[PDB]
UniProtKB/Swiss-Prot annotation, chain A:
Sites where the protein binds ATP: 51-58
Domain of life per record: Eukaryota
Short sequence motif named DEVH box, residue ranges: 144-146
Cellular localization per UniProt: Cytoplasm
Organism the protein comes from: Saccharomyces cerevisiae (strain ATCC 204508 / S288c)
Protein name, UniProt field: Antiviral helicase SKI2
Function text: RNA helicase component of the SKI complex involved in 3'-mRNA degradation pathway. Represses dsRNA virus propagation by specifically blocking translation of viral mRNAs, perhaps recognizing the absence of CAP or poly(A). Essential for cell growth only in the presence of M1 replicon.
Curated annotation (Swiss-Prot), chain C:
Cell location: Cytoplasm; Nucleus
Summary of the function given for this chain in its UniProt record: Component of the SKI complex involved in 3'-mRNA degradation pathway. Represses dsRNA virus propagation by specifically blocking translation of viral mRNAs, perhaps recognizing the absence of CAP or poly(A). Essential for cell growth only in the presence of M1 replicon.
Similarity annotation: Belongs to the SKI3 family.
Additional facts recorded: Present with 11900 molecules/cell in log phase SD medium.
TPR repeat residues: 47-80, 93-129, 130-163, 246-280, 321-354, 355-388
Name recorded for this polypeptide: Superkiller protein 3
Domain of life: Eukaryota
Subunit: Component of the SKI complex composed of at least SKI2, SKI3 and SKI8. The SKI complex interacts with SKI7, which makes the link between the SKI complex and the exosome in order to perform mRNA degradation.
Annotated source species: Saccharomyces cerevisiae (strain ATCC 204508 / S288c) (Baker's yeast)
Amino acid sequence: EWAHVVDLNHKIENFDELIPNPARSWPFELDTFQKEAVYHLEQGDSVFVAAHTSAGKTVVAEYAIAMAHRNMTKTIYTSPIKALSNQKFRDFKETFDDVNIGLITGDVQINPDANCLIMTTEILRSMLYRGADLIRDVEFVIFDEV
Amino acid sequence: RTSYQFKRTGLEGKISGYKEEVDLKEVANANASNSLSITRSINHNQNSVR
Amino acid sequence: ILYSWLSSKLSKYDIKSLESDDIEIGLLEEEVVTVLTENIVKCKNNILAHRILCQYYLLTKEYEAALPYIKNGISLIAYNIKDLGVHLPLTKREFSLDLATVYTYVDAPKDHNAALKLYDNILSGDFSNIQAKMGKGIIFIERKNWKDAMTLLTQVHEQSPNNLEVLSELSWSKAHMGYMDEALAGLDTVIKGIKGMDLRSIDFRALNLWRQAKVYIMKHASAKQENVKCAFKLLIQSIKILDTFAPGFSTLGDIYCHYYKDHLRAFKCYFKAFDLDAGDYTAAKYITETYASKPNWQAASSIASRLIKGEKAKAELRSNNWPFRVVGIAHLEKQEESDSIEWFQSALRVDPNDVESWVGLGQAYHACGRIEASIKVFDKAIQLRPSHTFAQYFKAISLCDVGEYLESLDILEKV
């Protein structure tokens, strides 16, 4: 139940074998504190990103699926705006290498058997009251713009 | 009330030996009464979310 | 301080030579210690006093208390070099020994190569120093780099050829190639020294009684079982002279099952190691092998308190996934399936091609609620292991619990 303040002036520079499996590694270099976020993800504890947009906030979104896809859990990206849902869906199609993505609308869900669903906050709320399928399968839920 | 369960042989026992057990908690597995325990029987009358 | 050290009662100095039932009243060592705190701390640029202060606390079972006056020792004349102006050729050679040896042995795995260029400074004309064998010993020997580690073990020649331990290093660590009898001979030549019966002096002897025992054990292999049975005298002596010594039973515990195959006291070896600690490779794997095959995993759960918790143990345990299944599977049969997953994640990361890490994790996933994940996992154990029989039943059940009887007809045909 504790929330420690990370100073952001420390680093464990063993990223090749800190993640013991071949998870993901990019040609563009990530920031040091955001590698630490990834490290914290694999431990089991929760996370909270207080950053800025257009400055590599997708580092957490990248390892949200990449951890879950190997370890066999699921992930929900939850955005309040519908346009944003479409946008980040497109992004997920683009950056990742063969991942089962999904998006819920009023009419019907795009990609029924999706690994990574996307939905509105209202639609998210409509899992806990209704009794949905993907609150069993999901462990690390992403929350957009808090 | 009983349940078939089968464990392991020993050190690095990839499914060979086994011993059984019994469980008991709350009531029958169904969402009509309550069954807040997450391990529950999924019926043929449910969508992706709603 | 300096005069009082010349008239000491430990190191190789003497009061009588330098002149040129009934309690005693001689010049004791306890008169020296009072001057090392009060008087020396006030005066600045006092280098020899600092050096001598360092050297007494350094070699006498302490790599910690000298640390404050090493940095100062540097500060003293290095700052004063501007406004006084004096030569310093020998400053970079004693403080090579004084600075680096504090970090080498105190921090056992961390700061070995602390000097870096300071040993390169001394090792030019004279083919090293006592420090370029003391500090660089663990660089060549313990971390394992057999290029100069094999050949260069009498690079202690220029300073002191006839020192007791350094000449015996020639074949001690280099005992895996062939020179085993020679090593034994050398170690015998290094034994004749203190031979004490106390906490301060006899530690060296205690540590020899592990040193030589290992060599004795080794010499048998590189056929006959003469010095295998006779090794007991050196191992049993190890757990005797000092007080408590864990590596005695642990090092030769797995050795008892080689030639004689005496696995009766192999049970008693790690039962004896339970007294000391037994935070190592063999003891845990054995303790599991007996208790878990009973079957009885409640006692196997007690090993988790010292298996992965050792911290330094994790470095040599991440090749295989043996220490993660011991702690992980102990939780499964005790019925707490939330804790199961994290261990199995690490295990998965370590070992990709495995059944028990996946199928065991898929059992937890089954029992927790994530049945959709269990289908994915169990069908991958069919993909990984050519055709596993138990995975098809588990998957069939998982297909049923969801509701689909699509492939349940086809899957149960082969089973």
